[PDB]
């Protein structure tokens, strides 16, 4: 198991994750925070080789990507009219997670 | 690119095995493999802790004082998100391929077009690529990554990560930042304020104190993020707070998390190469390992002149060999494959 | 329908009662329904009496089995404010109840209201001291699972090494009471078998023996659970007092009914 | 208000450490 | 910690710097014997009232 | 005698063989001894033939049961120098052997000499993949127990998630081979029962069916264990190669014997 700096924060206090409406939608938060122009150079002139070496180090250290059993889904509700995932304004697009 | 790093380390292990076979012709397969693995692990630890970490966190681990048997080195749940986001904020839209003579070659796309760089979103889980067919192509990828400047350490993510990350289920594309936020919620990660409090950092009470430089400029990401959280700073999650804290460096929360995690990893490891009690290396061998950098590994496995790479391949400074032609952007690169 | 996950995203239902009691009730209700269906086939005016007998018999059997498997022998319940979980100074207002049966103890922690501190508090945990089962191992597993503080406290109260000797006396009482109840159930089976035989006297004596064994189980449970030194159960600002639960009184009434039925059968045979 | 405003320390030493619940506990 | 230990070991614990969640505090097997003997070497034959 | 502790301070004995095989051998030897005792009661000159039949029958039965419970289907053994335990750089010289059976794998680590590094090295560990048994749980328990490095290595080689798919194929082969062997044992019981009946033809056909099922178990085990991709087992400076063990050849000879006996019985009946 992984360590914890703070006691686990769950909606039910055991395993149920905190989500909407108590927390903002993950896609809305990502669009609000991470949307911007590409091509901004690193202020420390760090290289891409360093970024992917760090990715290799992370793969060496931790791996929490593969799903567990039983299969639990925490789906990301795509807001209607999302430019990338809901271009047709369907309003029911859901990214499985 | 991650595959290129893996190939680099695989070739480094093979090269060390060949070196040890030359030094000890009588050694069997098992002994050669074990000695090569020991040396490669020591080199990997030295490069990751004393070269990559100081260059990418702007923080240096304290001087090694010995092995700590009673220190828990287990990876923390917060470290996963912190390291993942502090690295994903620097992923470029494309990657250059560089020749040994400071020549940036053209990249042949799967459309048969020629671009200036390898598009990241179109190379995910690539079984085969027209411009990646031999070992020399891997060497060119490594040199280009060494010469290319990464993205800015800020809240902005490229579309290759924000919109065209490999979708693990039912979708060829997904949002990596949204997936990371949903992972942090799944792992029960603490709030930004509680995470700061647990690490002894100064409490943040106003939204504009998260990143004073960010609020100084005309970027309204702080106000919009506060609006998304209904102005409740206590509900701000660890990942958005760490993303907003970054300015020229990972934010104090993420920097502290990664620094303490690596300190615990080094001190809590009995097989750390500097731990003289495990008998892995002698003092002279430990000095040799400390002197080894990633540039040495690249020179060794690529079989290239040392002057073709800067002494610290993690940071490119003026005067270093082969400057990048320009800071890469979405312009001029192949369009990401639709989901 | 597919294309989304999971296919059935609704909450998974929880069984609303004890499964052993539910199975016993279902089996005996099925037998009663079959007998009611065949009731018009019972010729003559005897059917009414027949019906009574059948019902009585089934009830007795069911009662015995239920009383042997129900954790309703020593019951107690308080309403308190108590600490809920570790790494949290918040307290919960809840009803804490103890249900000591023959084979173990059921500790109930029901929040008032159930939804407190953004958590559902309706715990009903079981800790068994049956032969071949290690109570200390179960308590250690409960500690590793992270059960709420009142549940862990009441479970540790019944550990074999706890200062107050509730574990030994309750285990002995439950074991021998269960043995006597199984003997009573076997006697009930034999009485049902032999009442069909021409010798009704032996069936009546077997029913009387069933009642006697039920009363003996009652007496043994009372005597073995009364010899215990006073173990003060203090939760929050209140004290939990245990008393003979519904299982004890059901055993009492069923054993008295069987004894009276056997005595009446013997007396009627002697007079007729 | 509740006079006991803190998390009462357990007598058995359990749950003292956040991730190592058996540290310092009885029987460890 | 701050009165008996300095007086009986002639050593003082370093200044408290905070709680360490990742430090194992379990009593070592060597500590049992060490403390037991360092205390038993000072047991008097008799005790005054 | 008392006044000292313990009363019996001698080393506690260890059983010198597998308990299931020992029990099977004891039961069949007891049956053989009873038959030898009653042998003079067998009247006439038939007794010799009778003796043969009895012996054959018993042997067949025993063989089947033994072959169903013996871990001697895929055997291999090497002599190597390997690391022994954690927190120790000392190496041991030992014979490391693998004994893959139907229900699991037995890993043997016998020191040469047994007394090395002031330790007794005669390990014979079992890791079962039988239905209802979790191999991963057993491997985790072995890791927590602290088994020597060769044993842990060979056990991890058979874990369900190990890169080489020995676990799935070996589990399937063992399961269906055991099922076929149980069918053969049932057919042997039926043949023994029906040979006493006047219809000897059906007894002969049942014996032939027993042989057929033994041969089918052999064929299924071979085909299912041959489809596996090559899993290199490398210990120290040597490689462990597995091959069909004594259980496989015992099954072969017993099945061939049963097939030939049934065929001869049918042919003799047809000719006479
Ligand atoms: C005397 O006591 C006896 C023992 O209690 C009693 O016998 C029992 O009777 C009852 C019926 O009367 C039965 O037991 C119940 O069974 C229910 C269903 O059991 C199945 O489901 C559970 C749930 O598993 C899901 O959740 C866990 C995490 O909680 C995950 O790890 C799982 O993977 C799974 O998750 C999936 O499903 C979720 C559903 O929403 C999804 O959200 C999720 O995404 C996933 O898709 C399984 O664990 C069970 O498996 C276990 O047991 C089997 C067989 O023993 C094992 O083989 C297996 O390996 C497992 O060990 C099974 O599959 C249970 O839900 C129910 O459990 C509740 O009660 C017990 C006892 O009080 C608690 O210990 C337990 O923690 C549960 O309490 C929590 O939840 C309830 C609401 O359900 C709350 O009211 C309660 O307060 C508590 O909430 C707390 O925790 C919550 C998180 O868990 C949190 O959200 C809250 O906020 C709060 O913090 C119960 O066990 C069964 O017949 C008997 N049980 C036995 C014999 O063990 C007997 O009748 C009593 N006698 C008398 C006279 O009364
Ligand atoms: C396929 O494999 C199958 C599994 O092996 C096999 O089935 C097995 O068959 C064998 C017989 O053929 C049987 O298993 C054996 O049983 C022996 C006796 O078992 C009883 O005793 C042990 C010993 O317990 C004492 O010691 C431990 C510590 O070791 C203490 O914790 C105990 O309290 C106890 O201590 C008292 O007694 C000591 C005696 O001297 C005193 O000195 C001491 O002061 C105390 O007074 C018990 O552990 C057993 O209980 C366990 O099992 C039962 C039932 O499963 C559980 O209910 C219970 O809770 C326990 O879990 C039982 O009571 C065992 O001795 C023997 O164990 C050895 O072999 C196994 C397997 O290799 C090892 O795992 C184990 O560690 C032992 O190996 C060590 O010791 C031998 C010498 O005895 C060495 O040769 C060996 O190299 C190793 O030495 C190493 O450790 C030593 C310390 O342990 C150390 O001194 C050395 O220097 C070295 O480091 C074995 O288990 C049984 O029938 C089957 N077992 C099953 C089913 O589990 C099957 O046949 C195989 N198939 C084929 C075809 O071959
Ligand atoms: C690539 O570099 C090699 C030597 O490093 C040189 O000979 C060759 O001409 C270069 N290729 C191009 C296209 O410049
Ligand atoms: C390591 O490098 C330093 C100079 O940077 C040199 O003085 C020292 O001898 C080197 N150590 C070894 C073992 O080569
Ligand atoms: C950073 O790299 C750019 C080229 O990408 C260069 O012009 C600049 O001088 C470098 N900065 C420093 C401080 O070396
Ligand atoms: C529990 O706390 C509530 C709120 O203060 C109080 O009204 C109630 O009387 C308390 N219960 C007991 C048993 O003291
Ligand atoms: C917790 O409970 C309160 C009151 O019952 C409710 O307002 C709130 O939405 C719940 N959830 C959280 C995460 O606070
Ligand atoms: C194991 O070591 C001994 C001692 O050096 C040696 O004689 C023997 O050949 C070795 N065994 C193998 C298989 O190499
Ligand atoms: C260990 O083995 C050696 C040689 O077999 C023997 O001389 C010695 O007495 C044994 N015991 C110890 C404690 O060294
Ligand atoms: Na960026």
XYZ file of N, CA and C in Angstrom, chain A:
291
model
N 0.826 -1.196 0.000
C 0.000 0.000 0.000
C 0.868 1.256 0.000
N 0.273 2.353 -0.456
C 0.941 3.644 -0.485
C 0.755 4.374 0.839
N 1.724 5.224 1.167
C 1.654 6.037 2.370
C 0.691 7.204 2.172
N 0.346 7.854 3.281
C -0.529 9.018 3.254
C 0.026 10.088 4.179
N 0.199 11.298 3.645
C 0.581 12.430 4.479
C -0.591 12.929 5.315
N -1.808 12.807 4.793
C -3.028 13.243 5.467
C -3.984 12.055 5.467
N -4.855 11.909 6.468
C -5.851 10.834 6.415
C -6.720 10.934 5.171
N -7.133 9.767 4.674
C -7.856 9.688 3.411
C -9.127 10.526 3.447
N -9.372 11.250 2.358
C -10.531 12.127 2.221
C -11.516 11.463 1.266
N -12.580 10.889 1.822
C -13.614 10.232 1.040
C -14.977 10.782 1.436
N -15.929 10.677 0.504
C -17.276 11.175 0.763
C -17.930 10.428 1.919
N -17.800 9.106 1.939
C -18.320 8.288 3.026
C -17.291 8.044 4.118
N -16.065 8.529 3.944
C -15.015 8.333 4.917
C -14.284 7.015 4.820
N -14.665 6.140 3.891
C -14.006 4.846 3.765
C -13.413 4.678 2.372
N -14.261 4.688 1.339
C -13.770 4.454 -0.014
C -14.469 5.262 -1.099
N -15.626 5.851 -0.826
C -16.373 6.564 -1.856
C -15.717 7.910 -2.137
N -15.287 8.172 -3.366
C -14.561 9.415 -3.650
C -15.449 10.640 -3.525
N -14.824 11.758 -3.170
C -15.501 13.046 -3.198
C -15.668 13.507 -4.645
N -16.880 13.919 -5.007
C -17.139 14.402 -6.350
C -18.213 15.466 -6.456
N -18.885 15.539 -7.602
C -19.929 16.530 -7.774
C -21.105 16.227 -6.846
N -21.821 17.267 -6.378
C -21.565 18.685 -6.651
C -20.609 19.334 -5.657
N -20.134 18.559 -4.680
C -19.234 19.110 -3.673
C -17.924 19.581 -4.289
N -17.452 18.897 -5.328
C -16.267 19.295 -6.063
C -16.640 19.631 -7.503
N -15.905 20.533 -8.148
C -16.216 20.877 -9.539
C -15.967 19.703 -10.473
N -16.625 19.757 -11.624
C -16.490 18.697 -12.612
C -15.037 18.602 -13.072
N -14.466 17.396 -13.161
C -13.051 17.289 -13.559
C -12.755 17.898 -14.918
N -13.656 17.733 -15.888
C -13.420 18.304 -17.211
C -13.519 19.824 -17.183
N -14.497 20.366 -16.449
C -14.592 21.817 -16.319
C -13.358 22.388 -15.633
N -12.891 21.730 -14.571
C -11.696 22.197 -13.875
C -10.472 22.139 -14.782
N -10.330 21.051 -15.544
C -9.200 20.926 -16.457
C -9.240 21.997 -17.540
N -10.421 22.253 -18.108
C -10.541 23.299 -19.119
C -10.256 24.675 -18.530
N -10.701 24.916 -17.296
C -10.486 26.214 -16.668
C -9.012 26.453 -16.365
N -8.301 25.427 -15.906
C -6.934 25.615 -15.428
C -5.912 25.441 -16.545
N -5.999 24.351 -17.304
C -4.921 23.944 -18.196
C -5.050 24.475 -19.619
N -6.111 25.207 -19.944
C -6.247 25.745 -21.291
C -5.332 26.949 -21.467
N -4.514 26.914 -22.516
C -3.590 27.984 -22.805
C -2.792 27.720 -24.064
N -1.966 28.684 -24.464
C -1.178 28.519 -25.689
C 0.035 27.627 -25.472
N 0.297 26.773 -26.456
C 1.482 25.933 -26.430
C 2.689 26.704 -26.959
N 3.875 26.194 -26.645
C 5.108 26.817 -27.071
C 5.788 27.697 -26.046
N 5.338 27.680 -24.795
C 5.970 28.468 -23.744
C 7.182 27.713 -23.207
N 8.369 28.276 -23.410
C 9.597 27.610 -23.011
C 9.737 27.586 -21.492
N 10.477 26.596 -21.000
C 10.739 26.495 -19.570
C 11.582 27.679 -19.105
N 11.199 28.271 -17.971
C 11.939 29.410 -17.445
C 13.316 29.017 -16.930
N 13.526 27.740 -16.614
C 14.829 27.226 -16.218
C 15.556 26.536 -17.365
N 14.992 26.576 -18.575
C 15.573 25.924 -19.752
C 15.777 24.428 -19.526
N 14.837 23.803 -18.823
C 14.873 22.359 -18.648
C 14.541 21.659 -19.961
N 15.174 20.512 -20.180
C 15.066 19.814 -21.451
C 13.972 18.750 -21.411
N 13.501 18.383 -22.606
C 12.484 17.344 -22.737
C 13.039 15.996 -22.291
N 14.326 15.756 -22.558
C 14.974 14.542 -22.073
C 14.836 14.418 -20.563
N 14.953 15.536 -19.845
C 14.741 15.502 -18.408
C 13.320 15.130 -18.034
N 12.340 15.657 -18.772
C 10.940 15.351 -18.485
C 10.679 13.859 -18.644
N 11.160 13.275 -19.741
C 10.884 11.856 -19.951
C 11.763 10.958 -19.088
N 12.950 11.421 -18.688
C 13.713 10.687 -17.684
C 12.978 10.677 -16.351
N 12.357 11.800 -15.988
C 11.530 11.820 -14.794
C 10.323 10.913 -14.914
N 9.735 10.841 -16.110
C 8.647 9.894 -16.341
C 9.119 8.456 -16.145
N 10.320 8.139 -16.635
C 10.886 6.808 -16.424
C 11.121 6.540 -14.941
N 11.618 7.541 -14.212
C 11.822 7.393 -12.773
C 10.494 7.140 -12.068
N 9.448 7.870 -12.462
C 8.129 7.665 -11.872
C 7.608 6.262 -12.157
N 7.778 5.785 -13.394
C 7.389 4.415 -13.712
C 8.175 3.414 -12.879
N 9.430 3.736 -12.564
C 10.224 2.883 -11.686
C 9.686 2.901 -10.260
N 9.192 4.052 -9.803
C 8.811 4.225 -8.404
C 7.390 3.743 -8.121
N 6.399 4.322 -8.798
C 5.000 4.062 -8.484
C 4.237 3.738 -9.762
N 3.156 2.975 -9.608
C 2.283 2.621 -10.726
C 0.899 2.331 -10.164
N -0.032 3.263 -10.357
C -1.391 3.124 -9.844
C -2.387 3.296 -10.983
N -1.987 2.907 -12.194
C -2.814 3.130 -13.373
C -3.748 1.963 -13.667
N -3.297 0.731 -13.449
C -4.109 -0.426 -13.798
C -5.308 -0.537 -12.857
N -6.494 -0.835 -13.385
C -7.691 -0.885 -12.539
C -7.676 -2.068 -11.583
N -8.403 -1.907 -10.474
C -8.509 -2.933 -9.463
C -9.777 -3.764 -9.593
N -9.886 -4.750 -8.701
C -11.033 -5.637 -8.668
C -11.718 -5.573 -7.308
N -13.062 -5.524 -7.268
C -13.958 -5.558 -8.431
C -13.946 -4.260 -9.234
N -14.374 -4.332 -10.493
C -14.331 -3.183 -11.386
C -15.226 -2.057 -10.889
N -14.614 -0.951 -10.478
C -15.327 0.236 -10.034
C -15.054 1.367 -11.011
N -16.110 2.058 -11.424
C -16.012 3.124 -12.408
C -16.364 4.458 -11.768
N -15.458 5.424 -11.892
C -15.685 6.798 -11.458
C -15.684 7.651 -12.722
N -16.840 7.706 -13.376
C -16.929 8.289 -14.707
C -16.819 9.807 -14.659
N -16.158 10.368 -15.665
C -15.997 11.811 -15.794
C -17.119 12.324 -16.689
N -18.028 13.106 -16.113
C -19.157 13.654 -16.857
C -18.664 14.805 -17.725
N -18.699 14.616 -19.039
C -18.291 15.658 -19.977
C -19.387 16.715 -20.042
N -19.072 17.979 -19.768
C -20.091 19.019 -19.866
C -20.590 19.142 -21.290
N -21.861 19.497 -21.475
C -22.396 19.636 -22.834
C -21.662 20.719 -23.613
N -21.469 20.466 -24.905
C -20.791 21.418 -25.759
C -19.292 21.494 -25.587
N -18.666 20.457 -25.043
C -17.216 20.458 -24.897
C -16.562 20.428 -26.274
N -15.594 21.305 -26.548
C -15.017 21.359 -27.903
C -14.380 20.056 -28.358
N -13.826 19.265 -27.439
C -13.097 18.053 -27.796
C -13.949 16.792 -27.714
N -14.686 16.604 -26.618
C -15.370 15.340 -26.376
C -16.866 15.378 -26.661
N -17.496 16.551 -26.631
C -18.921 16.689 -26.935
C -19.122 17.839 -27.914
N -18.644 17.695 -29.155
C -18.804 18.789 -30.125
C -20.221 18.933 -30.649
N -21.057 17.907 -30.509
C -22.410 17.908 -31.042
C -23.450 18.368 -30.029
N -23.020 18.801 -28.840
C -23.926 19.271 -27.790
C -24.927 18.188 -27.392
N -24.475 16.930 -27.400
C -25.350 15.832 -27.000
C -25.738 15.945 -25.530
N -24.787 16.315 -24.676
C -25.049 16.483 -23.263
C -24.991 15.218 -22.435
N -24.742 14.063 -23.051
C -24.647 12.800 -22.327
C -23.294 12.125 -22.510
N -22.306 12.829 -23.064
C -20.984 12.244 -23.254
C -20.343 11.996 -21.897
N -19.832 10.783 -21.701
C -19.228 10.373 -20.441
C -17.907 9.684 -20.750
N -16.819 10.196 -20.176
C -15.521 9.550 -20.306
C -15.374 8.489 -19.225
N -15.259 7.211 -19.577
C -15.128 6.177 -18.544
C -13.774 6.240 -17.858
N -13.793 6.045 -16.542
C -12.595 6.062 -15.717
C -12.743 4.993 -14.647
